[PDB]
């Protein structure tokens, strides 16, 4: 379906062109395969992002990255990429609002869930290749502070920083007042604590 | 060593195969002891 | 790693040095010599600079700013109009074999700061390359006070024996191409 | 004149069937094709593979004019379609489907390279030592 | 005169034709219109320094397609025909390229998604099998 | 003449053959002082324009305002600057960055790209 | 893996055909018996165990651990056998569930 | 299990070997024929025949699957059917206005000259790979079968994407050449962006 959509949209097939007359165009890749070229990557990239957040392209299974200094766009739909959920910030503000939080509390009798939340397009799954391109903000606090800070260009935001921790590093209290090898040593001993 | 104005007395090397070819087996005994002495002093610990 | 002076990526430290030393390695990871200086050279920076220059293994490739190959059979009508003054300068330079020199020209441009640091002269280079390749490699050079430093190179032959006796024992190698091999070797070999 | 507010409209016809199948003949702009020189041309199925599964062989003005080889469009229009639009004397358009798209590329004339007798061997010795003389000794 | 000879009359008449890329649903409607002798109308409107080309669908076949023109300076195209009478002919030269784009944006997608359903849907088994004995 | 005269004699690789479209090589005419370029597989030959056929080590390519394509300005992770006045348009919002190469070798010099549609103009500082 | 990959693999590209060496030393009139087999729909029961009796039953993953069984389920596939002999008949195809 | 990613080209340094640079591309969509993976595109270094041109660090070669010896990449292009250098360079250079790259590719074209025809180029690949036999034509058929099926299978396995495959080789040369001018930084071995 990704190949279908691109083909109907504007992407020229490799045999439709003479490279020396159109080589300046942005290249398109699908799972490491060179499908064609395109003369307007910003709109198309914006459109693809809009579709994935709209659920017309399978969000968890599709990563989409633009590398502008090489004027190419690769997309991957293969299995085995590690990706994490992140908040989408737009116009230098959160796209998630308090109305959604009250909707989430409502679930004690409501059928509204995390999947509904993703469909609101306020969160996206971002793999390590795509994580190379985002401007990720540590906290909404910093994103507010920006009026004096150096950066005002954020695109994603951390849902919380302790989440960078795996299961055993998560049982342990105040891990940052630990000298770092202590955290590794506990995670081992944690498997050996019987219970 | 053969070049002009280079002191032919104190000029030395951290290499051992070359020290042997030029200076001969006794000089290796001294230089090799010195190089071993040098790694040990760096690491700070003393060896008798 | 232990930061010290200018040096450092010097002498492997510790267990990797113990293994290197104790194995009697033919190829140490960082071989060095601590050289001491004498006379005025033991107390003067510029004298030390001079001895260092003799010691420093510099090759012509390290020295060259630029190279070019030009098609110019007769100098006295040079394709590079600015070169025209050396032709005035070099008409008496073996004036007979201008009828013999190949129409393929090599031109080298040298940096004045880098040439200064090695304290090297243009005549020593001409003499070094001439001596290495032989009288066949006909070299001429410029005035040291020019704002552009240039070396002008053609290739000559042995005159008498080359009259297409059988088919010229070269197998008709292209002469430009041979000039690249001169440029390949001239840079990579010449230990000025 | 009217040319600056001209509006034109034509009917479009798409006949269910045609006696002749419709093809594309494509050339590279780099190939500088000149149809004015095409006094004569032949179009035959290729013979390397020694019918409906083989590339095309195009011979223009015979052995003196240019010769081209035709390869079938490897990609397939599954999400698109290609059509030819033609004007008819009645004042309408007719559109015809593309049955095939063929990519035509120049073969070389008397360029001549045996590359078999001892060229593989000469290559082992090859130091870009020669180039013209070996082509001549043929 | 021979079977292997190509007719160059069309070429020699300098006949020009247009090449247009079109979406599947339109070709599918033309495949449903068969050969009635109409599928719609094509309209071309030019100004002082701009030219606008479009197609409009038949009301019946529905029961605006803008055209985007593409440079032909990059490749040279003509067309040949393989008759049932075994007589090959060169009909003319391609003088223009174009792509037919949809006017509907997002709603379209649903049709496409429906289209996706039509292309993609044989049973990937999955329904287990509850159980069998024979 | 002057040392200000730029160094671009025409590097030039392709102007290949006109018939079979393969690469041309220099070769001599000792009779007319003319360079010729010939295809090795055909009899076609034509005179050369410049006597230059190869140069090496401009060493200083400054590649400072070339290859750096203007679309770089859309990148959100690059630092926008309040430092004003593109040198072409009367608008700030230059995006800037170091080197972005391996052949830069030691550069710390900033490169500025105006990001509004009125320029695309780029310049070093 | 179950919902796509397994079905995809048996549907994919292993159709097979076989034909005896008939008309050996002699023959003529006919065309060497040939047979074609192709695999289609795939089926997977809930995990099952079979007692020595042969009686199949719903297995429970705990029972599997105490008795040391193997918590697995039986797999079945649609297979077709398909004749278009060299002339006299092209149909005589049979549906199985195996 | 963590592995290094599939059907993606990486250009990395390998200064310890004879290769100045290498382009590695492991080919397979894991969900197809599941065969193997190979192709290496390599920039040579450290050498000189003597008076050839001496400069070895432009002599680009390619390791192919099943082939017993390294072959120059231009030969592979000529085996795919392209015969004119401008067209190989068009497949290679895109921008067409980089004279520096054009001379960089130039010695590879100079090496190509002996096999300018497709059939002999295929036979050359045959001898470099297959067992020795008088079956030249069959050897060409084997060579054809390797380049169609066994080289970059993720690009296609049929005649119908044989042309497309040539564009992808040009991308592997292009990406390699880009790292060798230093216009592009090298791909790190341990970037999760390159793993599955």
């Amino acid at each position: 379906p990704i190949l279908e959509f691109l083909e109907e949209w504007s992407m020229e097939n490799l045999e439709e062109i003479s490279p020396a007359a159109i080589a300046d165009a942005t290249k398109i890749f699908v799972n490491g395969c060179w499908v064609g070229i395109h003369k307007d990557p910003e709109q198309l990239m914006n459109t693809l992002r809009k579709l994935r957040r709209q659920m017309d392209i399978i969000v968890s299974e599709v990563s989409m990255i633009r590398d502008i200094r090489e004027r190419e766009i690769r997309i991957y739909t293969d299995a085995g990429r590690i990706c994490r959920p992140l908040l989408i910030v737009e116009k230098q503000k959160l796209l998630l609002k308090k109305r959604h939080i009250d909707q989430l509390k409502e679930r004690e009798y409501n059928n509204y869930s995390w999947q509904d939340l993703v469909a609101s397009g306020v969160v996206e799954y971002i793999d390590t290749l795509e994580e190379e391109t985002v401007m990720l903000a540590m906290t909404p606090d910093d994103l507010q502070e920006k009026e004096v800070a150096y950066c005002s260009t954020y695109t994603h935001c951390e849902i919380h920083p302790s989440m960078i921790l795996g299961v055993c590093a998560s049982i342990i209290p105040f891990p940052d007042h630990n000298q770092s090898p202590r955290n590794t040593y506990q995670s081992a001993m944690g498997k050996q604590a019987m219970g | 060593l053969s070049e002009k104005d280079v002191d032919p007395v104190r000029t030395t090397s951290n290499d051992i195969v070359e020290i042997f070819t030029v200076l001969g087996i006794e000089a290796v005994r001294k230089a090799l002891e010195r190089e071993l002495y040098h790694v040990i002093s760096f690491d700070g610990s003393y060896v008798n | 790693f232990h930061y010290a002076g200018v040096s450092a990526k010097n002498v492997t430290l510790g267990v990797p040095r113990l293994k290197e030393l104790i194995n009697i390695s033919k190829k140490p990871k960082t071989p060095s010599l601590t050289v001491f200086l004498l006379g005025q050279s033991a107390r003067d920076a510029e004298r030390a600079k001079d001895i260092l220059c003799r010691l420093e293994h510099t090759t012509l490739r390290k020295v060259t700013a630029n190279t070019a190959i030009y098609y110019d059979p007769n100098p006295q009508s040079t394709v590079v109009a600015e070169d025209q003054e050396w032709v005035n300068v070099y008409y008496e330079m073996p004036d007979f074999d201008v009828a013999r020199i190949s129409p393929w020209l090599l031109r080298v441009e040298l940096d004045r700061k880098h040439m200064t640091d090695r304290k090297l002269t243009m005549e020593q280079i001409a003499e070094k390359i001439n001596a290495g390749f032989g009288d066949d490699l006909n070299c001429i050079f410029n005035d040291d006070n020019a704002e552009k430093l240039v070396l002008r190179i053609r290739i000559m032959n042995s005159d008498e024996n080359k009259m297409q006796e059988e088919e010229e024992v070269v197998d008709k190698m292209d002469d430009d191409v041979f000039l690249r091999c001169i440029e390949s070797n001239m840079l990579t070999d010449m230990t000025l | 004149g009217p040319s600056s507010q001209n509006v034109t409209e034509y009917v479009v016809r798409v006949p269910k069937n045609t006696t002749k199948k419709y093809n594309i003949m494509a050339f590279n702009a780099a190939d500088k094709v000149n149809f004015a020189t095409w006094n004569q041309a032949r179009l035959e199925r290729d013979l390397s593979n020694k019918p409906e599964d083989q590339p095309w062989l195009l011979r223009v003005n015979g052995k003196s004019g240019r010769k081209f080889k035709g390869i079938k469009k490897g990609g397939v229009t599954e999400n698109t379609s290609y059509y030819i639009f033609t004007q008819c004397p009645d004042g309408a358009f007719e559109a015809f489907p593309v049955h095939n798209w063929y990519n035509f590329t120049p073969l070389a004339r008397h360029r001549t390279l045996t590359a078999e007798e001892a060229e593989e061997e000469w290559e082992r010795r090859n130091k870009v030592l020669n180039h013209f003389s070996i082509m001549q000794q043929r | 005169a021979e079977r292997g000879e190509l007719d160059l009359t069309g070429a020699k008449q300098n006949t020009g034709v247009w090449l247009v890329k079109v979406p599947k649903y339109l070709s599918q409607q033309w495949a449903k219109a068969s050969g009635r002798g109409e599928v719609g109308k094509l309209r071309i409107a030019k100004t002082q320094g701009r030219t606008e080309v479009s197609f409009t669908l038949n009301e019946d076949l529905a029961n605006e397609h803008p055209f985007v023109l593409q440079s032909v300076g990059g490749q040279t195209l003509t067309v040949f025909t393989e008759s049932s009478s075994d007589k090959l002919s060169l009909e003319g030269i391609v003088v223009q390229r174009a792509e037919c784009r949809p006017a509907a944006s997002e709603n379209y997608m649903r049709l496409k998604r429906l289209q996706i359903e039509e292309s993609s849907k044989p049973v990937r088994l999955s329904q287990q099998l509850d159980k069998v004995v024979t | 003449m002057e040392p200000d005269g730029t160094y671009e004699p025409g590097f030039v690789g392709i102007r290949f053959c006109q018939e079979c479209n393969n690469m041309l090589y220099p070769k001599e005419d000792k009779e007319n002082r003319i360079l010729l370029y010939a295809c090795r597989n055909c009899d076609y030959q034509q005179e050369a324009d410049n006597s230059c056929i190869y140069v090496n080590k401009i060493t200083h390519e400054v590649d400072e305002l070339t290859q750096i394509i203007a679309d770089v300005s859309q990148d959100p992770t690059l630092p926008r600057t309040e430092d004003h006045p593109c040198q072409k348009c009367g608008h700030k919002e230059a995006v800037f960055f170091q080197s972005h190469s391996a052949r830069a070798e030691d550069a710390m010099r900033l490169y500025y790209v105006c990001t509004a549609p009125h320029c695309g103009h780029r310049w070093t500082e | 893996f179950i919902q796509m990959s397994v079905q995809r693999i048996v549907e994919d590209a292993p159709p097979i055909d076989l034909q005896a060496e008939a008309q050996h030393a002699s023959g003529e009139v006919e065309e060497p018996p040939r047979y074609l087999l192709k695999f289609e729909q795939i089926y997977l029961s809930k995990p099952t165990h079979w007692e020595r009796d042969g009686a199949p039953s719903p297995m429970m993953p705990n029972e599997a651990r105490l008795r040391n069984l193997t918590y697995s389920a039986p797999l079945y596939v649609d297979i077709t056998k398909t004749v278009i002999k060299e002339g006299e008949e092209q149909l005589q195809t049979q549906h199985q569930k195996t | 299990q963590e592995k290094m990613a599939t059907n993606t080209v990486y250009v990395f340094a390998k200064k310890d070997s004879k290769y100045a640079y290498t382009g590695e591309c492991r080919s397979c969509l894991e969900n197809s024929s599941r065969p193997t993976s190979t192709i290496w595109v390599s920039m040579l270094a450290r050498g000189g025949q003597g008076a050839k041109k001496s400069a070895i660090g432009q002599r680009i070669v390619a390791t192919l699957p099943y082939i017993k010896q390294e072959v120059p990449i231009i030969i592979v292009f000529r085996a795919l059917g392209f015969v004119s250098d401008r067209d190989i360079l068009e497949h290679i250079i895109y921008d067409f206005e980089d004279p520096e790259m054009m001379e960089m590719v130039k010695p590879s074209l100079d090496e190509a000259f002996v096999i300018q025809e497709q059939n002999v180029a295929l036979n050359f690949i045959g001898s470099r790979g297959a067992k020795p036999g008088v079956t030249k034509e069959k050897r060409i058929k084997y060579a054809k079968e390797v380049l169609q099926k066994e080289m970059l299978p993720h690009v296609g396995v049929s005649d119908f994407c044989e042309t497309k495959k040539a564009y992808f080789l040009g991308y592997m040369v292009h990406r390699l050449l880009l790292a060798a001018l230093g216009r592009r930084e090298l791909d790190d071995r341990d970037h999760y962006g390159n793993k599955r």
Side-chain angles (χ1 to χ4, degrees), chain E residues 122-134, chain G residues 3-4 7-8 11 41-46 76 97:
Chain E
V123 177
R124 274 301 93 93
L125 188 236
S126 85
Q127 70 287 357
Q128 303 193 342
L129 180 87
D130 187 53
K131 57 183 178 184
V132 290
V133 284
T134 67
Chain G
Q3 302 278 161
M4 188 60 181
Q7 182 58 92
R8 183 79 169 83
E11 194 204 288
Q41 179 58 34
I42 212 174
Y43 302 127
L44 180 57
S45 311
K46 286 179 180 66
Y76 313 77
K97 189 140 292 332

Side-chain angles (χ1 to χ4, degrees), chain F residues 1 7 9 32 39 48 59 63 85 103:
Chain F
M1 296 182 181
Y7 189 74
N32 292 290
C39 181
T59 67
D63 194 17
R103 230 226 76 260

Side-chain angles (χ1 to χ4, degrees), chain E residues 73-85:
Chain E
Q75 292 187 339
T76 305
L77 279 64
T78 56
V79 157
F80 65 103
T81 54
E82 42 173 355
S83 61
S84 303
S85 302

Side-chain angles (χ1 to χ4, degrees), chain E residues 10-130:
Chain E
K12 294 186 179 181
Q13 287 181 345
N14 201 22
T15 308
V17 293
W18 289 11
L19 175 62
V20 191
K21 187 181 287 183
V22 302
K24 287 315 279 189
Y25 62 81
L26 182 59
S27 58
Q28 285 169 303
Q29 298 338 287
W30 298 350
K32 287 168 61 190
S34 59
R36 69 178 181 197
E38 82 271 359
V39 297
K41 293 198 291 174
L42 190 79
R43 194 176 72 268
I44 303 90
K46 173 180 174 179
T47 67
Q48 295 178 345
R50 186 181 71 251
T51 309
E52 294 170 357
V53 179
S54 71
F55 172 84
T56 299
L57 199 70
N58 199 333
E59 282 180 7
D60 180 271
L61 187 59
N63 196 51
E64 177 163 69
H65 278 70
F67 282 27
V68 292
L69 307 180
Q70 295 302 331
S71 299
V72 296
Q75 292 187 339
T76 305
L77 279 64
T78 56
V79 157
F80 65 103
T81 54
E82 42 173 355
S83 61
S84 303
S85 302
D86 209 76
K87 290 185 176 180
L88 283 173
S89 291
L90 200 55
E91 298 282 322
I93 310 86
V94 176
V95 297
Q96 191 57 275
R97 281 170 60 145
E99 185 184 359
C100 176
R101 298 176 60 73
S105 60
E106 276 170 11
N107 188 337
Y108 208 80
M109 303 310 179
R110 184 170 180 190
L111 179 158
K112 290 305 311 192
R113 286 196 287 259
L114 288 170
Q115 184 58 37
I116 292 165
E117 287 288 291
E118 192 173 289
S119 202
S120 55
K121 284 308 176 300
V123 177
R124 274 301 93 93
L125 188 236
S126 85
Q127 70 287 357
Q128 303 193 342
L129 180 87
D130 187 53

